[PDB]
Design a protein around this ligand. Sequence first.
Ligand SMILES: CCC(=O)n1c(=O)n(CCOc2ccccc2Oc2cccc3cc(C#N)ccc23)c2ccccc21
Ligand SMILES: [Mg+2]
Ligand SMILES: [Mg+2]
Lengths: 401, 549
Amino acid sequence: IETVPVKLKPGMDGPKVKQWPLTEEKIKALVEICTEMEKEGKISKIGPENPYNTPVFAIKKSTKWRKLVDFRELNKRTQDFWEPHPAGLKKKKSVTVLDVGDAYFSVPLDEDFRKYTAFTIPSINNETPGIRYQYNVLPQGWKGSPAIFQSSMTKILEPFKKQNPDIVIYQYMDDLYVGSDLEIGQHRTKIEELRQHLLRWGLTTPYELHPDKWTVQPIVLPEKDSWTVNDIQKLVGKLNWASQIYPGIKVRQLSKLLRGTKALTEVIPLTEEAELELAENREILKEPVHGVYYDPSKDLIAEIQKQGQGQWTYQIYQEPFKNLKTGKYARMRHTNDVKQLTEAVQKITTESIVIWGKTPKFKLPIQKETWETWWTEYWQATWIPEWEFVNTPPLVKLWYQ
Amino acid sequence: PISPIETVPVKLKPGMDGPKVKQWPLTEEKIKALVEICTEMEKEGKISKIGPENPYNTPVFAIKKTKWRKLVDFRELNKRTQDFWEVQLGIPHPAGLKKKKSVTVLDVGDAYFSVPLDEDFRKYTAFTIPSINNPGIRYQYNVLPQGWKGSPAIFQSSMTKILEPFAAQNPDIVIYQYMDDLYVGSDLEIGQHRTKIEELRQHLLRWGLTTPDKKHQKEPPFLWMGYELHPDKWTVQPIVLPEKDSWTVNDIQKLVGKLNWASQIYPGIKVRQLSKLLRGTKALTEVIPLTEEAELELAENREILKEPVHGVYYDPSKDLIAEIQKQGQGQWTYQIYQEPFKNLKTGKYARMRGAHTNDVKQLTEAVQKITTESIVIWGKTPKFKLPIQKETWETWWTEYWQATWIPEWEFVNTPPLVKLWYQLEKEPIVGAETFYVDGAANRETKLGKAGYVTNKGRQKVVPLTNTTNQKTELQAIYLALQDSGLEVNIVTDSQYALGIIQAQPDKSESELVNQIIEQLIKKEKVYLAWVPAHKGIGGNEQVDKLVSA
Ligand SMILES: CCC(=O)n1c(=O)n(CCOc2ccccc2Oc2cccc3cc(C#N)ccc23)c2ccccc21
Ligand SMILES: [Mg+2]
Ligand SMILES: [Mg+2]
């Protein structure tokens, strides 16, 4: 019933972000949702003296519509206030995500800070200036909400952690990550006990992960019965690339097999010395890299390459050529490029939350306006990472393939 | 006039005090006009005489441009008052208005002066009528001043709250709000509608908002924000493309402005060569000499603007449909309509988004632009009738490294059809001569050379002046295309050149790449391979030593 005073970082004004145009259907879904939230006291209409704004989106997590707020800019502008992570969570065999964001609506928001949560339901064709609201309670998606609720959350979870000491519970924004080494049936039972415990204590709740099976995918070299000059040139070029990461790689015996000026389709027998050199290079790629250490002060970066036939490769790093994690997602196709990319982004971000406790900054292989138009059609998570848009085609594709 | 509306609280920016801009002396005639205007405004409650304690001032002026009017320079008070929720910048687009049996235009008279101003803020609007002697008639505002930062957003807000009631008990009357105007439409009997208008008038008059009587209500055609609104159609206002011997930067900006404006209804407007002229642009005063292509473009625009064109309004009951046609090199044009020859609106798209591109890429971007604009104007995406076949587009978007969202569309066979002019090979070509190419340039003397060595024993070096390592690496590829048969394998060490060719462009800013494209189209099979430089890979090392010596 009492509010927790919230501040913005010194010398920083509230967010002023443009609301994106929406289809009539998503606007209609937002008006219904916001009428009900206004009747419940969670939001109130505001006047023209509030200049701030945060974008809102209608998504589905899924037969009914849900409202998602892009508080990325407000989170940057209050972060001092909201900025631990357990390293054991990635080790657990099963990890289940629980949406606990509805519990934030029990807690009133600092009256002086509410104006910074302003948002706009847009009109079509600029017919109306748009419907304006701000938040009376802690909004989902604001990094201040789990931080203010944190004491209540510890209090509710204390009995359960007492009962189950080997079970890991990590909270990131609106979600709880719950890790065990138990058998899958025992795990889902322990999850359901925690749900019912939360439900009987007034926290409403609506994802099974297995980080014990993740890994930084090793570089793979082709295996062919007959090699052409072109195949050896590709091979030598890929090995030359990997030699920036793995120092012991050599290509002298392989490139010797091309000495002269040969037709690209000419068949070259893989001689012994060259075959040993290739076999040695296959062994060095099995061993992992060294000196790749995570730095909590630096931003995580994710790159993604379209590989075709529903496959997408990705790398997470903080410094070039120092990958912390690599991976390859596949889609068992009704599918399209945007659906697969949206899904890959959410998977990578979830993996990143589990492993390091923050979201990476994505370099997305898509045109900005195409992403801005369609990203909500398949977005089911309650968070939103940073992103930018790039091309970088060259050979990155075939090397991570 | 002044309304019983609640006020909006207003603050100055934190740490800022009110303006104290001293008043300039005014002609005795202007002092007299101000005195009679202010006594009439004090009489109406809009302003009030204040004591000598108010330390704030804002300069006041009077002009007739007879009808003397009072103008107040609020620049300093504006710089000191808080920001507000931005009033409507975007205006409605005529093509998104839903046709209505009846439409009425109400001008609210003295709109701002009818809305009260926050009590605690009135002291900062203080102004003084000058005394020839110097003396000093201090005043302050009680209503929204004209030219103050807050008036548009606070009047907007107030009018929304005022209208809420009538709207509720009249949920079938559409009431657009825009500045100090209201545009009311309905599908009723001219009589019922009129009566409903008169009700809204009297309701607004109960809140202090005067509105026009039939004898004074504006009539169609409506000249509004550069448009012409008729009852059943809309178009843009007269566009006069000037005729000049010499053209400045500023003249070209105004010219592409008007042409961009005309393109929303006149199909076929092209602006790309003209806006190419403003690249380094610099000062709006610099004379920019016109290109032959800019002259032809402008001349084709005047041909189009010779014929009158109109758009129709929206019927949410009929499908929304978009067609796209190629309009030359990199230039595209589109129509959006519900009835096959009755256009809601048109537009164009002529962006290369890079030095090189291809037709299918540009068409997909055009569709993207249309999608975004449809959501803005109608709240939905259209159906697409496009001059490209599924095999063409599917091949492209499958092979394309960038994620793409291709709508459901219907091939319309109307040349020129969008096609892939060529396709590189995916596998090396048997029997085709293999060209090992390389180029080099001296980064100081700017001199260079392009050369090849093939597997048949042919070698060649061509010399180059005023060039760079990047350009010579493209010239080496061009040379191998020139000297080869209809099938050719090419091996380069240039990541630069490989990236340009692998993208498979069919149009370019650089004539060299344009030349390479002409060669690629005449070939039957081209395979392009890449190898790391200076790694002694056969064939590549020979051309390097060749173009290096
Ligand atoms: C059909 C008869 C007719 O005169 N007009 C018509 O159907 N439209 C399209 C529908 O537009 C409106 C719908 C509801 C409220 C007002 C409407 O008209 C306007 C909308 C937006 C801005 C406007 C600005 C002016 C001015 N000046 C006038 C009307 C506006 C029409 C649109 C314009 C004019 C007549 C009709
Ligand atoms: Mg908003
Ligand atoms: Mg070279």
